[PDB]
Design an enzyme around this catalytic site. Sequence first.
Site, mmCIF file in Angstrom:
data_model
loop_
_atom_site.group_PDB
_atom_site.id
_atom_site.type_symbol
_atom_site.label_atom_id
_atom_site.label_comp_id
_atom_site.label_asym_id
_atom_site.label_seq_id
_atom_site.Cartn_x
_atom_site.Cartn_y
_atom_site.Cartn_z
ATOM 1 N N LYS A 1 4.472 -3.306 10.731
ATOM 2 C CA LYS A 1 4.385 -2.500 11.936
ATOM 3 C C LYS A 1 5.759 -2.369 12.586
ATOM 4 O O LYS A 1 6.669 -3.166 12.348
ATOM 5 C CB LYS A 1 3.389 -3.109 12.922
ATOM 6 C CG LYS A 1 2.040 -3.449 12.312
ATOM 7 C CD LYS A 1 0.909 -2.734 13.035
ATOM 8 C CE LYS A 1 0.646 -3.348 14.400
ATOM 9 N NZ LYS A 1 -0.478 -2.673 15.104
ATOM 10 N N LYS B 1 0.187 -3.634 18.031
ATOM 11 C CA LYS B 1 0.842 -4.109 19.244
ATOM 12 C C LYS B 1 1.258 -5.568 19.122
ATOM 13 O O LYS B 1 2.447 -5.883 19.113
ATOM 14 C CB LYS B 1 -0.076 -3.930 20.453
ATOM 15 C CG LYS B 1 0.094 -2.603 21.165
ATOM 16 C CD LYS B 1 1.546 -2.373 21.539
ATOM 17 C CE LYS B 1 1.971 -3.289 22.671
ATOM 18 N NZ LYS B 1 3.446 -3.486 22.693
ATOM 19 N N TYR B 2 0.268 -6.457 19.035
ATOM 20 C CA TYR B 2 0.562 -7.884 18.959
ATOM 21 C C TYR B 2 1.358 -8.222 17.708
ATOM 22 O O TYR B 2 2.332 -8.981 17.769
ATOM 23 C CB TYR B 2 -0.738 -8.685 18.996
ATOM 24 C CG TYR B 2 -0.564 -10.162 18.733
ATOM 25 C CD1 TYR B 2 -0.287 -11.039 19.765
ATOM 26 C CD2 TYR B 2 -0.686 -10.678 17.451
ATOM 27 C CE1 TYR B 2 -0.132 -12.383 19.530
ATOM 28 C CE2 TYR B 2 -0.530 -12.023 17.208
ATOM 29 C CZ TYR B 2 -0.254 -12.870 18.251
ATOM 30 O OH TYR B 2 -0.098 -14.215 18.015
ATOM 31 N N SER B 3 0.966 -7.670 16.565
ATOM 32 C CA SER B 3 1.583 -8.014 15.293
ATOM 33 C C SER B 3 2.825 -7.188 14.986
ATOM 34 O O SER B 3 3.471 -7.430 13.964
ATOM 35 C CB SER B 3 0.567 -7.859 14.159
ATOM 36 O OG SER B 3 -0.672 -8.449 14.507
#
EC number: 3.6.4.-
Lengths: 560, 640
Positions: A130, A1-3
């Site tokens: 990602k 998510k964040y990355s």
Amino acid sequence: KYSGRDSLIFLVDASKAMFESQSEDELTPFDMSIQCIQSVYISKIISSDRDLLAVVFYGTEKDKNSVNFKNIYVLQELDNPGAKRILELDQFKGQQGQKRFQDMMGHGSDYSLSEVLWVCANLFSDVQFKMSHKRIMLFTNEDNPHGNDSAKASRARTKAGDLRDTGIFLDLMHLKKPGGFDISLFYRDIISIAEDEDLRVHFEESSKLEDLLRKVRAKETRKRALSRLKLKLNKDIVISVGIYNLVQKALKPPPIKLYRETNEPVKTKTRTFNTSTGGLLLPSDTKRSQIYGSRQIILEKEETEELKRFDDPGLMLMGFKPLVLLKKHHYLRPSLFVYPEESLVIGSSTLFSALLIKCLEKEVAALCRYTPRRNIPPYFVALVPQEEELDDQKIQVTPPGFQLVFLPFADDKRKMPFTEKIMATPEQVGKMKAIVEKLRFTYRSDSFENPVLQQHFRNLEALALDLMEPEQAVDLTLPKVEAMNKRLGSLVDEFKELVYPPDYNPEVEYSEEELKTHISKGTLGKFTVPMLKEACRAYGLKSGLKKQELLEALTKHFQD
Amino acid sequence: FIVCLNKVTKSFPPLADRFMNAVFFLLPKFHGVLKTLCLEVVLCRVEGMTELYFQLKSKDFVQVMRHRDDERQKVCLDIIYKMMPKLKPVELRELLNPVVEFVSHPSTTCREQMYNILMWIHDNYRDPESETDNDSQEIFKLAKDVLIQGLIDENPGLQLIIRNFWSHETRLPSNTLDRLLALNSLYSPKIEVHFLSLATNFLLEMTSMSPDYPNPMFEHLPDIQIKHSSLITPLQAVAQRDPIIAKQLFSSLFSGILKEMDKFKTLSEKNNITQKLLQDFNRFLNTTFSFFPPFVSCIQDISCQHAALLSLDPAAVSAGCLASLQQPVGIRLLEEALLRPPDVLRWVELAKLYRSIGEYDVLRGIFTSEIGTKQITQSALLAEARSDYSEAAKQYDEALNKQDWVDGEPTEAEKDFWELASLDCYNHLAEWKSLEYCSTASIDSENPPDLNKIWSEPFYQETYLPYMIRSKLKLLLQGEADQSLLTFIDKAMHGELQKAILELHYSQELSLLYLLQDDVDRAKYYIQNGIQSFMQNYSSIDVLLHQSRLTKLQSVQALTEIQEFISFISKQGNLSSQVPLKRLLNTWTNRYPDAKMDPMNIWDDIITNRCFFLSKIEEKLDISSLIRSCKFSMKMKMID
């Protein structure tokens, strides 16, 4: 998510009707698409310079792809946007650009519309990072690519459904051309965003391409916790919350030093050099110091950080205050945001929700002592309960939670000079009301852009793509003085006559001997600070900035 | 997701059909055992889906095979085996390259799967031989090459499987003569060390179906006379052990079959069989790269004892014998062929063979009657017979440059012999300057570019290269600053066409050149390689071939002298003080290549090397009019 980093793949048609268009001042659709892709690149490199962008022309005579497929060209593979990537694209703008594309790529060469979608999925599947989002815009001036061969249409539909199942959402930005047909046709079951629309058959204008709001050249997207603190209702019962910031000042990225000869970054090396005796110094023989008059206070490094430690990092609740006691005038820092998090303490969200409900029911705000880091002095905070507000489109605009409000100390409040209360009268407050009503304004947060940042970004764009002149930003915060004056009317003059009185317009050279004689003369007068400074510097005496410093030092030393 | 999908589909193949696109999408995002799980999931459903090759090509399936991972490589070979029957020849050619670079792999299960797919690819691409496609006739050829290379691998079970596959009908005919003929088609010069044993194994395996296994006598404890199978089987077990008995067995079997064909055959067909055998033997001698002494000897031996195979290519015979150091058998074959125009070629090859093992008297004898038929050549050879290497070379070069001789226009072979003998005569004399120019003046114009011109038409390397390099080396150690090999050698250290040839034979010269421009660390390696090469050459030489072992032995003096000099210079302890130098000079002046026993080439090598070593020593440190005294005494001993 964040990355995860968002990814984008363009898909520009290159058909025969894609190139030839109406013979007027209107841009050919190919130039429109290239300009729009260039604009998207420019917007996405200044903002979030980590996403992946790639452009895959289809319908060309040449071919370049991982798996050999006819009439599909991958001009660029997935990578961060760069200046060279923009410059590799602007050569196709204009009639000369059209001819360059034709001689370098070609046109016609009927395609399949399926292998292109397969190719896009290939680059999407070739990334070692990602994939937060996967999108494929389809710039096209035609709406019924097939119809003479139903098999190709079925294969395209199957591949599109497969892409949607994989998690790839394509949305075509349709291009309008002369004629009468851009009908909702064999593209409706393909748009995997499936955006809501009237789906009107007889569209007669360019489709959702102006929706880009081209070149929104200011953004830095990110979401992070920024802290993870404990909210102590008492000494023993504590809950764990996170401290996010909703609005934060935006600054231009810091400059980088460069070596002029090679234009490569130069690393810096800051180190406290010798005491004019040679060697290097320890963090252990350099103590901090301060001087007050003739008294010198010598204090160690760690003891300097020891005198500003009061509480352990956390929010110590100290009571509840009515909302009507939180004045609007008092304000120091941008208001932070609190959300319940359940990584350090399990069960914080339930107590937090109960507290929020019963705190906004009684219109009260929690008062706490705030210490964000290990050695920061405490700072009182009023936690205002912010109730969730949602639009009809199920879009959250004010997420629920608690909002910090930094209450200033008495040290941070300044005192105004005494002023005399003079009040207006009727018959001109009414005039002011009429003017104000004539100057209505529906203020929105997404209204203005930082003119300095906009100018700096445009200058950088001009200096990276040699645009031969920087783009002049339309300063959105500049008042429309002529338009608002015309809209206002003559009542401004009625105002001016009503209150303003008729007469109220509102609108070296020095040496030894001259100083030796002058100290007895005692003036050192028209002698300017710039020349006192140069005298004390070139002569070598200690110098400051205030006049009295030099006037005393030179007088005391030169004679005595 | 992938772990659960593989676990579910481990017992339920029908599922994961709807997840094929997804699993292919996530395939290139993994690097560990999860990749193996993905390939296994792919393996579950290979038959029921199409367009698989495109997806694998998109996911660089070729590259992941070459990664060293037992399970991943086995699964990759398995999926290849499953989807190969639906492939296309153009795609199969691409798929064949990464799977054939796999024979040198451990984990014999991978090799077993390899040979399984290769047996399939050989059975269906055999073709009715109608011309259909180049790829269809290329992948079959590439696969057949790899299959023969599988006959010499480890894990004797796998080798037995391959042998059974190769010995099955429709590949090697069950007929004795047809099997013998077809065995030549299974050469595969990648394997020849075991070729004779495998050929005789195939020949004698068929006899086990023969309806003859009684006691081949009437029995009469004084006698334990026993059936046939107790003699053939130990014969094969010992033939596959060492090569000499295998060579003897194959030669005897070949001779017996060839003799016995004469009854059940006709002359017109016999000629075709003999021609085919001769062509196969020529291919054997031409394509061979790691010349096996017993194999080459066996081939030439069976050639010598048959009037139809005596026409074997003399150039191939000469090259094979020279490379494998089996001169006498080729000499006998050529002599027999010369006992029943393309005759001077045989004489030239015989001279080349004889020159290698000394016996210069016979060389001069055959260089008169057959090569020659002039008057200058006889006089030159007579002068060279006695120790007179001045008049012979002089009149050789006089006969070399001439617009006269309208009385027959001397043949090309005689002119080549003139040039070679002139070079040799210049070598016997101390005329290195005169030798180098005449050795290099045969490939180009004035100031020839001795670069890749000698490295073409390998006759140039065979003839002019050694004399030229020796002349330049000797000239440089003389003292002349005429550096031309340094660039030539340095740029010759690239590839196999200029390094392997320059290292197989010339290693003492390379050591001298390298310790010349001091990088002694490489010179030490080169001299150790040279000593090892000499040891191998001596080991290969026969034991009763005198005057040839002596020639190889006479160079150990120079080899040891250079090695001792390298050891002396390396240790700085001997550099200090003068008693190490005195002891070295005393030792050097005590041992000499004995006069009246060694030809002057050895004397020149020893004396030049010693003088150059003394000169090199006279740069870091009496020790004068003493070193020069030793030099003068050595030269005086040379003169005596």
